Structure 1
Amino acid sequence: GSEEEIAKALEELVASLAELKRATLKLLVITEELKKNPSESALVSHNKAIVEHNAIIVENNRIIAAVLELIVRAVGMTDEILLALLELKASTARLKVATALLRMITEELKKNPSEDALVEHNRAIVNHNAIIVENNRIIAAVLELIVRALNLTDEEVRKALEELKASTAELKRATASLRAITEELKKNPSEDALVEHNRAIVEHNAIIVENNRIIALVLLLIVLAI
């Protein structure tokens, strides 16, 4: 694309990041309210808020994939870039599918809520997040390839990539930890467990938001360096 398109899309990206931050703060609020005064309708409303937060994350990842497609068409594809973009487009479609899945089981829970339904819903949130994680790893791999293909020497870019790789390994560890406590919850579901679990979900989402911030810094540095 043209420099106007890239710049406009980065304005949309930074707008989406501000919106994502605002939503994360709100979600932390309602997480605290649920912790202090836990109840079944509080659990249902908290889960629905997590679904709307995840939908915002998915739109953020869509905008990032769009920007990357415009950037790569600017610089030119390469074998490893093209293979990573085909992996990215596949993961994007898989995410739209899991997003619809989550929204539909959310509506089932809202209509017919129960503790078993909350457990099933939390497990589906954890799977949705694991798909977001894989989306972020592929986007990070794309940015790694774009920088190595340019041979870009900016120390600010190298520093931001060291941050992005650290955040990625941290995100793998946090994902594994969340799947572990999810397998505990599935074994021993209880309201106290549902609360502790939703807390761990919100921590995982916060780490994903930090990952998306670092990703956006890498995109901004690349678009300035070309």
Structure 2
Amino acid sequence: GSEEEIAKALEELVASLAELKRATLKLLDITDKLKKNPSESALVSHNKAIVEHNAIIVENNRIIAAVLELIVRAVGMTDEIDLALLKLKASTARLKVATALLRMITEELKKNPSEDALVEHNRAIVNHNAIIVENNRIIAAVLELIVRALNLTDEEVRKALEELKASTAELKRATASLRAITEELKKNPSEDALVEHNRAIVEHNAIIVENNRIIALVLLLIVLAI
């Protein structure tokens, strides 16, 4: 597309980030304290603020992938970029099936709510998060490819990639740790461990959002450098 289409898509992107950061802060805050004990309606909506947060992350990743396509179709594909973009499309398609699965098990929780089903639902949320991390690792690979293809040596871009790589490794380590503790919850299913597992989820979602922030930065520094 032309410059105005990319600029409109980047305004949609930065407004989506400004919405996702507020929702992240409020989800940590409602994760912080509550003395009182939950209702039956608090089973029917067990984790609704997390599934609603993940949906915003998935919508942010879809826009990032649409901007990457609009950029590359401007600067011109090469073999390796086209292979990486096709991988990115296959991963974005996988994310739709993973979302429709989480959105099914969440509604099936309206009908067999029980302390065991709550652990199944939490494991479904961990598997959705583990697939969002893959989508981000592919988008970051496509971006490093586009930056090398343009021979784009500005120090702002260099430093923004040096930050993006470290944020990607931080997100890998956090995902492996979340799956490790989720196995321990699978061994020892309890309300006591469920309460402290919900925090581990919210603290992994925080790292996802702190990675999408850098992906949007590198996208801006590229569109300004071209």
Q: TM-score, normalised by structure 1?
A: 0.96
2:46–2:118 contact (8 Å) kept in structure 1 = no
Partner-residue secondary structure (3-state), 1:189: coil
1:36: how far off? 6.8
1:112: how far off? 2.4
- 1:213 and 1:189 map into 2 onto residues whose CA distance is 34
1:111: how far off? 3.1
Structure 1: stretches of 5+ with no match in the other structure = none
- 2:13 and 2:33 map into 1 onto residues whose CA distance is 30
- 1:34 and 1:103 map into 2 onto residues whose CA distance is 26
2:44–2:110 contact (8 Å) kept in structure 1 = yes
Q: TM-score, normalised by structure 2?
A: 0.96
Structure 1 window deviating more from structure 2 (150-159 vs 111-120): it is: 111-120
Partner-residue secondary structure (3-state), 1:110: coil
Summarize the Cα distance change of 1:188–1:212 in structure 2 as closer, same or farther, 3 Å threshold.
Answer: same
Alpha-carbon displacement from aligned partner over 1:9-39 (angstroms, at most 9, x marks no partner): 0000011101111211221122124577566
1:213: how far off? 0.1
Partner-residue secondary structure (3-state), 1:81: helix
1:160–1:217 contact (8 Å) kept in structure 2 = yes
- 2:39 and 2:169 map into 1 onto residues whose CA distance is 35
Identity of aligned residues (%): 98
Summarize the Cα distance change of 1:210–1:47 in structure 2 as closer, same or farther, 3 Å threshold.
Answer: same
Summarize the Cα distance change of 1:35–1:144 in structure 2 as closer, same or farther, 3 Å threshold.
Answer: farther
- 2:210 and 2:40 map into 1 onto residues whose CA distance is 30
2:43–2:113 contact (8 Å) kept in structure 1 = no
1:115: how far off? 1.0
Query: 1:18-57 to 2 correspondence within 5 Å?
Result: 18-33=18-33, 37=37, 41-42=41-42, 45-57=45-57
Summarize the Cα distance change of 1:35–1:119 in structure 2 as closer, same or farther, 3 Å threshold.
Answer: farther
What is the root-mean-square deviation of aligned Cα atoms in Å? 1.5
1:106–1:121 contact (8 Å) kept in structure 2 = yes
1:30–1:46 contact (8 Å) kept in structure 2 = no
What residue is the counterpart of 2:148 in the other structure? 148
- 2:57 and 2:190 map into 1 onto residues whose CA distance is 28
What residue is the counterpart of 2:196 in the other structure? 196
Alpha-carbon displacement from aligned partner over 1:56-109 (angstroms, at most 9, x marks no partner): 000000000000000000100111110100000000000011001001100111
Partner-residue secondary structure (3-state), 1:24: helix
Summarize the Cα distance change of 1:78–1:84 in structure 2 as closer, same or farther, 3 Å threshold.
Answer: same
Which has more helix, going by share of residues? 1
